[PDB]
Amino acid sequence: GSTAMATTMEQEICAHSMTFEECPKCSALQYRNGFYLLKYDEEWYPEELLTDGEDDVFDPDLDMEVVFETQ
């Protein structure tokens, strides 16, 4: 337990990536941008809402593990 206002949970529990408090910011795709590979598996959703057809990942439904796994 931490002395957090209104006993808010510290970790970023929102589905998109951020905290419950930071949930409106989750809608913004700024966080998603600046990442080397969209396809790389992280908490954030690989398919980007703004980029409809630009990504061209979902339409062909081709996932290459080797490409995303740089590490």
Binding site residues, Zn ion, CB under 5 A: 14, 16, 23, 26
Q: Tokens for 60?
A: 């062909």
Nearest to Zn ion of 35, 69 (CB atom): 35
Nearest to Zn ion of 35, 63 (CB atom): 35
Q: Compute the distance between CA of residue 63 and CA of residue 57 in angstroms, rounded to an integer.
A: 8
Q: Is 54 annotated as a binding residue?
A: yes
Q: Compute the distance between CA of residue 9 and CA of residue 6 in angstroms, rounded to an integer.
A: 9
Nearest approach in angstroms of CB 64 to Zn ion is 28
Name which of 13, 19, 21, 57 is nearest 39 in CA terms.
Answer: 57
Q: Is 14 annotated as a binding residue?
A: no
Binding-site positions for RNA: 26, 50-54
